Amino acid sequence: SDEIVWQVINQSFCSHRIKAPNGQNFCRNEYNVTGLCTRQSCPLANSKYATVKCDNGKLYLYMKTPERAHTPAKLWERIKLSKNYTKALQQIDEHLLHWSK
Amino acid sequence: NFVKQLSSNNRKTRVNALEALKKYLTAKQFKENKQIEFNKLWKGLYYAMWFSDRPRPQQRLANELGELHGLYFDPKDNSTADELTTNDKAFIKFSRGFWKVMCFEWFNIDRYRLDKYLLLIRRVLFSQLKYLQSRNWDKKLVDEYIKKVLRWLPLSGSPKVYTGIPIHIVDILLDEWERLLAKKTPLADVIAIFQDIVADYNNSKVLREKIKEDLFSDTR
Amino acid sequence: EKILTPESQLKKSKAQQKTAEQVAAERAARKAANKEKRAIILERNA
Amino acid sequence: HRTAPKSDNVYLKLLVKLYTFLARRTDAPFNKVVLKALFLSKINRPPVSVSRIARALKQEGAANKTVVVVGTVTDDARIFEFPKTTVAALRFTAGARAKIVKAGGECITLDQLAVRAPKGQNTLILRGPRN
Amino acid sequence: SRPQVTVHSLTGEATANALPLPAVFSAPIRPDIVHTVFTSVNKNKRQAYAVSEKAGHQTSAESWGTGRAVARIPRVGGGGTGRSGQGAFGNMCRGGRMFAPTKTWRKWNVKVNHNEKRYATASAIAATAVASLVLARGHRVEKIPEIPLVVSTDLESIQKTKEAVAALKAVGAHSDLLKVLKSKKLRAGKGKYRNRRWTQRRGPLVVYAEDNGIVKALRNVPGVETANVASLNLLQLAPGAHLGRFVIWTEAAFTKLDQVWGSETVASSKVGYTLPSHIISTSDVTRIINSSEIQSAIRPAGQATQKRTHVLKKNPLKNKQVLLRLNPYAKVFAAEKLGSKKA
RNA sequence: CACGGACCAAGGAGUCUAACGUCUAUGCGAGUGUUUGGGUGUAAAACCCAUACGCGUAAUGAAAGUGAACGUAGGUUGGGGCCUCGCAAGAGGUGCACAAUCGACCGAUCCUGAGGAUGGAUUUGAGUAAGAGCAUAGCUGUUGGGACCCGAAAG
RNA sequence: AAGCUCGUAUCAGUUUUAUGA
Kindly report the three-state secondary structure assignment for every residue of chain D: CCCCCCCCCHHHHHHHHHHHHHHHHCCCHHHHHHHHHHHCCCCCCCCEEHHHHHHHCCCCCCCCCEEEEEEEEECCCCCCCCCCCCEEEEEECHHHHHHHHHHCCCEECHHHHHHHCCCCCCEEEECCCCC
CA gap B179, E80 in Å, rounded:
115
What is the distance in angstroms between the Cα of A45 and the nearest Cα belonging to chain E? 8
Of all nucleotides, the one whose C1′ comes closest to residue E215's CA is F42
Separation CA B11–CA B5 (nearest Å): 10
Name the residue among E121, E112, E125 with its Cα closest to residue E40: E112
Q: Which domain covers residue B57, as residue numbers?
A: 1-220
Q: What is residue A58's three-state secondary structure? A: coil
- Chain C residues whose beta carbon lies within 8 Å of the beta carbon of residue A98: 3, 5-6, 9
Chain centroid, CA E310 distance in Å: 48
CB atoms within 10 A of CB E31: 24
Residue D92 dihedral angles phi and psi, to the nearest 5°:
-100, 120
Residue B188: HSE in the Cβ half-sphere, 13 Å Cα cutoff: 3
Nearest to A92 by CA among A84, A83, A81: A81
CB A27 within 8 A of CB A36: yes
Distance from residue E107's CA to nucleotide F138's C1', rounded to whole Å:
15
Sequence spans of domains, chain D: 1-131
In this structure, CATH architecture of domain A1-101: 2-Layer Sandwich (3.30)
Reduced 3-state DSSP string for chain E: CCCCEEEECCCCCEEEEEECCCCCCCCCCCHHHHHHHHHHHCCCCCCCCCCCCCCCCCCCEECCCCCCCCCCCCEECCCCCCCCCCECCCCCCCCCCCCCCCCCCCCCCCCCCHHHHHHHHHHHHHHHHCCHHHHHHCCCCCCCCCCCCEECHHHCCCCCHHHHHHHHHHHCCCCHHHHHHHCCEECCCHHHHHCCCEECCCCCEEEECCCCCHHHHCCCCCCCEEEECCCCCHHHHCHHHCCCCCEEEEHHHHHHHHHHHCCCCCCCCCCCCCCCCCCCCCCCCHHHHCCCCHHHCCCCCCCCCCCCCCCCCCCCCCCCCHHHHCCCCHHHHHHCCCCCCCC
Tell how strand A59-64 and strand A76-80 pair up: antiparallel
- The number of C-beta contacts closer than 8 angstroms across A and B is 21
CATH of domain D1-131: 3.100.10.10
Give CA–CA dist E237/E253, Å, rounded. 15
Alpha-carbon distance of E271 to B206, in angstroms, equals: 47
CA dihedral B22, B23, B29, B30 (to 10 degrees): -80
For residue B97, the one-letter residue type is G
Note whether A70 contacts E: Cβ–Cβ < 8 A. yes
Residue D124, beta-bridge partner list? D67
Cα–Cα–Cα angle for D55, D57, D63, rounded to 5 degrees: 165
DSSP helix, strand, coil percent of chain B (3-state; round to 5): 60, 0, 40
Distance E244 CA to F133 C1' (A): 35
Compute the distance between CA of residue D17 and CA of residue D25 in angstroms, rounded to an integer. Answer: 13
Q: Check CB contact under 8 Å for B59 and C7.
A: no
Which residues in chain D have Cβ-Cβ distances shorter than 8 Å to A3? 14
Residues of E with CB under 8 A from a CB of C: 290, 292, 295, 300, 327-329, 332
DSSP B6: S
Beta carbons of C8 and E329 less than 8 Å apart? no
CB < 8 Å to B113, chain A: 66-67
Residues B50, E2: Cα–Cα separation, whole Å: 12
Q: Give CA torsion, residues C28, C34, C35, C39, to 10 deg.
A: 160
Q: Is B96 exposed, middle or buried (0-12, 13-18, 19+ CB in 10 A)?
A: buried
Strands D107-108 and D87-92: parallel
Burial class (CB in 10 A: 0-12, 13-18, 19+), B202: exposed
Neighbors of chain C with 3 or more C-beta pairs under 8 Å = A, B, E
Three-class secondary structure of residue A49 per DSSP? strand
Q: What are the φ and ψ backbone dihedral angles of E206, each rounded to 5 degrees? A: -125, 105
Count of all residues that appear for chain B in the document? 220
Measured between CA atoms, how close is B100 to chain A, in angstroms? 23
Amino acid in position A99 = W
What is the CA angle E306-E308-E310, rounded to 5? 145
Q: Are B197 and B154 in contact (CB under 8 A)?
A: yes
The Cβ-side half-sphere exposure at B134, using a 13 Å CA radius, reads 10
The total number of structural domains that make up chain B: 1
CB E138 within 8 A of CB E127: no
Q: What distance in Å separates the CA atoms of residue B150 and residue B169, rounded to the nearest whole number?
A: 12
- Phi/psi for B100 (5° steps) reads -60, -40
Q: Which residues of C13-22 are buried (b: 16+ CB within 10 A; e: fewer)?
A: eeeeeeeeee
Which technique was used to obtain these atomic coordinates? cryo-EM
